[PDB]
Design a binder for these strands. Structure first.
Ligand code: MG
Ligand code: MG
Ligand code: MG
Ligand code: MG
Ligand code: MG
Ligand code: MG
Ligand code: MG
Ligand code: MG
Ligand code: MG
Ligand code: MG
Ligand code: MG
Ligand code: MG
Ligand code: MG
Ligand code: MG
Ligand code: MG
Ligand code: MG
Ligand code: MG
Ligand code: MG
Ligand code: MG
Ligand code: MG
Ligand code: MG
Ligand code: MG
Ligand code: MG
Ligand code: ZN
Ligand code: ZN
Lengths: 201, 127, 25, 214, 97, 97, 91
RNA sequence: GGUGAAAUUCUUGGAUUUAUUGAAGACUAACUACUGCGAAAGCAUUUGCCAAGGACGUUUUCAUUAAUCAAGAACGAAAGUUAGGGGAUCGAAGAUGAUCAGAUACCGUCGUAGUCUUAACCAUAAACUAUGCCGACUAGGGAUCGGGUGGUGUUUUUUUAAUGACCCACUCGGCACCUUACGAGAAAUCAAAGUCUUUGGGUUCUGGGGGGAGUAUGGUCGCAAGGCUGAAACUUAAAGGAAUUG
C-alpha cells in the first residue's frame, strides 16, 4: 500500500559490535550494493543524507525532516522531492519548496536525502476497472467505494433525500461548521473549473 | 568647485520625468514631472510643462545642496519606441539655464539584444 | 464575399450535412 | 511638517588607488540612530563616474567605471573595483555598416580570487588603397581572431587581482597585443575591452582593501 | 584515436579476450597492455591491476563500456578486458597510453 | 499586373528572412522588405547647444549623438516618412537622397 | 503475420473502457514490461517487479526506478543537476 | 498610466521613478547587405562534438553506370490535435472602457487556449520567380560571392624575405543588377518568356467559356479538424487579361 519502494540499509553500531538496519524510502537510481553516506560532512550524491544546510541551493532532496531528528517527514510519496531555494546562515534556517508548492523554512540542521523518491509516474496510468481500485484500497484502508451522499436519505447525510437527487444548498461549508455538517467543499475559497496556468509564483 | 548629483531624465510621450539622485543612486533628491505642473492629461509631456517642472526640480536641487549633476536621459525603450520624448529636450534646456551645472551626459535607453514580442500583434496598431 | 470566408462558409456547410447524415447511418 | 531635508545626515565619497582624484563625490544618508543606523544599512552602494573625469585626460571620455563602497570610517567611505562599462554613444559609433563585427568574452578568476567576465570588441578595417567599398573578414577569420583574443584575455586576468588588471586596463595595453597577434590574420580597427563585469568576490578581508589607501 | 590504434592491433597483432584468459597471460608475463572496460566491476578491475603491477604491465582504463569494448576489437559480443600479446604495427605500446 | 521586379522589396536568393516590428504601428514586416533609417541626432538640439557649454564644466566637453536604427512598415513609411510615391520610371531609381 | 492492427498487448481488454484509456495503458504497459539495459553488467536483463523496482536477471542488482520505466525524465534531470552542483563544490 | 481626445486601470499598499541583488522563460538586436547556405520548408550569440555538402583544383579512379519520371516514399512555415513538461512575453476565445444610429469590430484594459519544448499527429500557405527538369545555341557592361592560375603589384619591417590583407588581368561556378533588341509577345515586359506557319533535341505535369463547385457521390488517409481523388443536372453571353483615354 505504498507507492515507492523501500530501501533496506544496514549500518555498524558505533557503540556496540552489531549491525543496525534502517528502513529508507528508495530514491530513484539507488541500488543494492550501493554505499550510503549520512552526515554533516558528507558528500553530495543521490542516496546520501545531508543536512539541508550543507547542500547548495537548487539541490534536490527527499524525505526531509521538519525539525531535525524527526527522522523524515516531507516529500516521501512516490515521485515527490524538495528543493532548497535559499539559506539564512545567521539563524541557520534553510528555505525549501515542498511538493505542494508551499515554501517552508526549517533548520539547516534538518536532514534530507539527495534525489527524488522512486516509482514516479505511478498515477499516469488509468486504473481502468473497479477491481484495480478495489485491490488498491484493499491494502490501504476501507475507504472505497464511495456512495454519493446525494444518493442517501436525509437521516444519513446533509445531501440526502428529495424527489430528484440534488444538494439543495451550497456545498461550500464554513470552517466554523460542526461535525455532522462538514460534507461538501469545506472552507472553499473559490469553486468551479480552474482555467489558466496554476503554478504558485 | 561643485557637488555632483545625478539627473536621470526619462522622457517618454504623455509624460516626462526629472529627478536628481546621489551619485550612487541609492539616495534620491527631489523629482516632479510634467503631469505635476499642468492639468489636462493630453498636455503631460509637452515642453512648456516639462519646463515648469524642470523649474521646480532645479530649485530643490539647490534648496538642499547639490550644485552640479551629469544627466542620463532615457526613453521608454525595452520593446518600445526608443526615441526621445517631446519634453526631455525642454528639461535639459531648462536646467542648464536654471542655475546648476552640466558635464558628461549619456543615454541609458534600454535597448535589448532584441526580443520579447512587441505589442499590437502581427498587423500592427491599425487605424 | 471574400474568397476565404466562403471557403469557411462551405466548410461549415459540410460539417452540418456530415452531421445530418450520421443521424441515419 | 517634516521635510526630510532638516534631518538627513551627509557624507563624502573617496576613490581608491590607480587613478587621479580619490576625492569624488558626496551623499545623503539618515542620522546614525541606535537601531537602523546610517552605517550598516547602506554605505555599500556603488557609483558610476567616467574615468576621464577620474583620470583627468580626455582620451578617456568613454569607458565607464563602477565603484562599490566597501568600507567606512567617519565622513570618509572608501570605494574599490566593481566593474567597467562603455558609453553607449561611443559603441553605437564603432558599429558602422559595411564592415564585419567581432565580439568575444571569457569568465575568469584573478589572484585575489575576484571572478569576472571581460568582453572584447573589434571590427575589420579597409586598408589604404582598398577599392572594394566594404571589407569583410571570412568567418574562418573571425573564429581565429576570437580564439586569439581569448588566449590573450585569459592570460592577462589571473595576473595579481583586478589590482594589476585595473592597472592593466587603464593604459589599454591589452588592446595592442590583440592587434599585435591579430594583423597576422586580417586588418581590424577599434579593438577595445569594452565591458567587464564582477560576479564573485571572496571574503571581506579589511587587510588587502586597506592596501590601496593612505 | 585510441580505437583506431586498437584497430591496428586487431588486424595485425596477437591478443586474447576476457577475464580468465588475460590472467593466463599476466601470469605468464606475456601481456604488453591490458585494457579495462568502464563498467567492469571494481573488484575485477582491482584484481587485474594487482596482477598487472606484479608482472610490471601497464593498464589502459578504456573509458567506454564492455559492450563497446567488444566492438572496438571488432567482435559482435562484448569484452570486459583485452590483453595485448604483441602490437603488430600499432604504436599503442609506445604512444600516449 | 506585377508592378515591381523587386516584387515587394529585395530578396533574391533566399526564401525566408525573419520579420521585424514597425517602429510605428508595430506591424510585422520582413527585414528585407523593411525600410530603414539611421536616426543619428545629438543629445541636445537647436539652441540648447549654446546654453549647454556655458553652464557646463569642462572646456567644450565633446557632444555625443544618439544612434538608433529605424524600421517602418511601408504603410507607415508611406503615410508620413520616406515614400512620397514615384512616377512609373522615377520608381526604378534606387539612388537615395 | 500481423495479429492486431493497433491494440497490441492492449487487446486483452477487448472492447471495454474506451479506446482513449486503452491507448494510455498500452503506453505505460509497454514501458513497464520491457527488458532494459543493465548499467552495471552491460547485458539487457532489467525487468520490473512492483513499481519502482528494477532488477537485473543475470548479475542480480536491483535499482530504484520509475513506476513503469527504469529512468524517469525528472530522475535523470535531477541526476545531472546534483552532479553539476557537486562539482561546483570542489572547484 | 494609456490615447486623436478619454475612460476602464494603479496609487499610505508609497505607486510611476530610483537603487542593489535574484528568479523564470523567450529571443538573438546593432554589425544585416539587391550578401552566404539548403531539395524545398527554412537557417544569424559562443564553444566542443557529430556525421553531411556544392564550387574549385586534378596528365587520379570507373567507363554509359545517364536524362526525366505514373505508382510508391523522405522532408514539409504557421495554426490546429494527443500525452508530459514550460507557461517571461505577446496574446484566437471571453469579459470589459470607450467610440457609433448601431459597434458582436477598429483603439484601450483584463486575459483562457496558444506562443516554447519532448514524444507522437496533421500535410496544408499568394509553400511565389504566380514561370518543370536535363542538353545545345544566340549579346554588350560594370560590381560582387567561392575556388584557382598568373604579377621584378601596393601595404605590413626585422635585415630582407615567408606570410596576411589590399591592387590589377584572366578563368570556372554562384546570388544579382545595368544597357540593349538580333529576337519574342495581346501587351506589361522577357537573355528567356529567344533560336515556332522557315512550326520536331529529350522528358514530366496541368488547362480547354463562365457559373454550378472543389459542391454531391464513392473510395481512401486522419483522434479530430480536415487531406487526396472528384462528377453531373441546371443555368448563362459573357467572365477574363494587358494596355489607352477619361
Ligand atoms: Mg468497503
Ligand atoms: Mg460514488
Ligand atoms: Mg463519489
Ligand atoms: Mg434512495
Ligand atoms: Mg439532516
Ligand atoms: Mg444544510
Ligand atoms: Mg437532497
Ligand atoms: Mg444531481
Ligand atoms: Mg490608415
Ligand atoms: Mg439516432
Ligand atoms: Mg489593370
Ligand atoms: Mg494594382
Ligand atoms: Mg516561402
Ligand atoms: Mg548577436
Ligand atoms: Mg495502385
Ligand atoms: Mg501563457
Ligand atoms: Mg471581443
Ligand atoms: Mg459596448
Ligand atoms: Mg464577439
Ligand atoms: Mg496547394
Ligand atoms: Mg513572392
Ligand atoms: Mg552576359
Ligand atoms: Mg450544386
Ligand atoms: Zn507601420
Ligand atoms: Zn546486470
Amino acid at each position: 500500500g505504498r507507492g515507492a519502494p523501500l530501501a533496506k540499509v544496514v549500518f555498524r553500531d558505533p557503540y556496540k559490535y552489531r549491525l543496525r538496519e534502517e528502513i529508507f524510502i528508495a530514491n530513484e537510481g539507488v541500488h543494492t550494493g550501493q554505499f550510503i553516506y549520512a552526515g554533516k560532512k558528507a558528500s553530495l550524491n543521490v542516496g546520501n543524507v545531508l543536512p539541508l544546510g550543507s547542500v547548495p541551493e537548487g539541490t534536490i532532496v527527499s524525505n526531509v525532516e521538519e525539525k531535525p531528528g524527526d527522522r523524515g517527514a516531507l516529500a516521501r510519496a512516490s515521485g515527490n522531492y524538495v528543493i532548497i531555494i535559499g539559506h539564512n546562515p545567521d539563524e541557520n534556517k534553510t528555505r525549501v519548496r515542498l511538493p505542494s508548492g508551499a515554501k517552508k523554512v526549517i533548520s539547516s540542521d534538518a536532514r534530507g536525502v539527495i534525489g527524488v523518491i522512486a516509482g514516479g509516474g505511478r498515477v499516469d496510468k488509468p486504473l481502468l476497472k473497479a477491481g484495480r481500485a478495489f485491490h488498491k484500497y484493499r491494502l490501504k484502508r476501507n475507504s472505497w467505494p464511495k456512495t454519493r451522499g446525494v444518493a442517501m436519505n436525509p437521516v444519513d447525510h446533509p445531501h440526502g433525500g428529495g424527489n430528484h437527487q440534488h444538494i439543495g444548498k451550497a456545498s461550500t461549508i464554513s470552517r466554523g461548521a460542526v461535525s455532522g455538517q462538514k460534507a461538501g467543499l469545506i472552507a472553499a475559497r473559490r469553486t468551479g473549473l480552474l482555467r489558466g496556468s496554476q503554478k504558485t509564483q | 568647485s561643485q557637488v555632483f548629483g545625478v539627473a536621470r531624465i526619462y522622457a517618454s510621450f504623455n509624460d516626462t520625468f526629472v529627478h536628481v539622485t546621489d551619485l550612487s543612486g541609492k539616495e534620491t533628491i527631489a523629482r516632479v514631472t510634467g503631469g505635476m505642473k499642468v492639468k489636462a492629461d493630453r498636455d503631460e509631456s509637452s515642453p512648456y510643462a516639462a519646463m515648469l517642472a524642470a523649474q521646480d526640480v532645479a530649485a530643490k536641487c539647490k534648496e538642499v545642496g547639490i550644485t552640479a549633476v551629469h544627466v542620463k536621459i532615457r526613453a521608454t525603450g525595452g520593446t518600445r519606441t526608443k526615441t526621445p520624448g517631446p519634453g526631455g529636450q525642454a528639461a535639459l534646456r531648462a536646467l542648464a539655464r536654471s542655475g546648476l551645472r552640466i558635464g558628461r551626459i549619456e543615454d541609458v535607453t534600454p535597448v535589448p539584444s532584441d526580443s520579447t514580442r512587441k505589442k499590437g500583434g502581427r498587423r500592427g496598431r491599425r487605424l | 464575399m471574400r474568397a476565404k470566408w466562403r471557403k469557411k462558409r462551405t466548410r461549415r456547410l459540410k460539417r452540418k450535412r456530415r452531421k445530418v447524415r450520421a443521424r441515419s447511418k | 511638517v517634516v521635510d526630510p531635508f532638516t534631518r538627513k545626515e551627509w557624507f563624502d565619497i573617496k576613490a581608491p588607488s590607480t587613478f587621479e582624484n580619490r576625492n569624488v563625490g558626496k551623499t545623503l544618508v539618515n542620522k546614525s540612530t541606535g537601531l537602523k543606523s546610517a552605517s550598516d544599512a547602506l554605505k555599500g552602494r556603488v557609483v558610476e563616474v567616467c574615468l576621464a573625469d577620474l583620470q583627468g585626460s580626455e582620451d578617456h571620455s568613454f569607458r565607464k567605471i563602477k565603484l562599490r563602497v566597501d568600507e567606512v570610517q567617519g565622513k570618509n567611505l572608501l570605494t574599490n573595483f566593481h566593474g567597467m562599462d562603455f558609453t553607449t554613444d561611443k559603441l553605437r559609433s564603432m558599429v558602422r555598416k559595411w564592415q564585419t563585427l567581432i565580439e568575444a568574452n571569457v569568465t575568469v578568476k584573478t589572484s585575489d580570487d575576484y571572478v569576472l567576465r571581460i568582453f572584447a570588441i573589434a571590427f575589420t578595417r579597409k586598408q589604404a588603397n582598398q577599392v572594394k567599398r566594404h571589407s569583410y573578414a571570412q568567418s574562418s577569420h573571425i573564429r581565429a581572431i576570437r580564439k586569439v583574443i581569448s588566449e590573450i584575455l585569459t592570460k592577462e586576468v589571473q595576473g595579481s587581482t583586478l589590482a594589476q588588471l585595473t592597472s592593466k586596463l587603464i593604459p589599454e595595453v591589452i588592446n595592442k597585443e590583440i592587434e599585435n597577434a591579430t594583423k597576422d590574420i586580417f586588418p581590424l580597427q577599434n579593438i577595445h575591452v569594452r565591458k567587464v563585469k564582477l560576479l564573485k568576490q571572496p571574503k571581506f578581508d579589511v587587510g588587502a582593501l586597506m592596501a590601496l589607501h593612505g | 584515436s585510441i580505437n583506431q590504434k586498437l584497430a591496428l592491433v586487431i588486424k595485425s597483432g596477437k591478443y586474447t579476450l576476457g577475464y580468465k584468459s588475460t590472467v593466463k597471460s599476466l601470469r605468464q608475463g606475456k601481456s604488453k597492455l591490458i585494457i579495462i572496460a568502464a563498467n567492469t566491476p571494481v573488484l575485477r578491475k582491482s584484481e587485474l591491476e594487482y596482477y598487472a603491477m606484479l608482472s610490471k604491465t601497464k593498464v589502459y582504463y578504456f573509458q567506454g563500456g564492455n559492450n563497446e569494448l567488444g566492438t572496438a576489437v571488432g567482435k559482435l559480443f562484448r569484452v570486459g578486458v583485452v590483453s595485448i600479446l604483441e602490437a603488430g604495427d600499432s604504436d599503442i605500446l609506445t604512444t600516449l597510453a | 499586373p506585377k508592378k515591381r521586379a523587386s516584387n515587394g522589396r529585395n530578396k533574391k536568393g533566399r526564401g525566408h528572412v525573419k520579420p521585424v516590428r514597425c517602429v510605428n504601428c508595430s506591424k510585422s514586416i520582413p527585414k528585407d522588405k523593411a525600410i530603414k533609417r539611421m536616426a543619428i541626432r545629438n543629445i541636445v538640439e537647436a539652441a540648447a547647444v549654446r546654453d549647454l557649454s556655458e553652464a557646463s564644466v569642462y572646456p567644450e566637453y565633446a557632444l555625443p549623438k544618439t544612434y538608433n536604427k529605424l524600421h517602418y512598415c511601408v504603410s507607415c513609411a508611406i503615410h508620413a516618412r520616406i515614400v512620397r510615391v514615384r512616377s512609373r520610371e522615377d520608381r526604378k531609381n534606387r539612388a537615395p537622397p | 503475420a500481423k495479429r492486431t492492427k493497433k491494440v497490441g498487448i492492449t487487446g486483452k481488454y477487448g472492447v471495454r473502457y474506451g479506446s482513449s484509456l486503452r491507448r494510455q495503458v498500452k503506453k505505460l504497459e509497454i514501458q513497464q514490461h520491457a527488458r532494459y539495459d543493465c548499467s552495471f553488467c552491460g547485458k539487457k536483463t532489467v525487468k520490473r517487479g512492483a513499481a519502482g523496482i528494477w532488477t537485473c536477471s543475470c548479475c542480480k542488482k536491483t535499482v530504484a526506478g520509475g513506476a513503469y520505466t527504469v529512468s524517469t525524465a525528472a530522475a535523470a534531470t535531477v541526476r545531472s543537476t546534483i552532479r553539476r552542483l557537486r562539482e561546483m563544490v570542489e572547484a
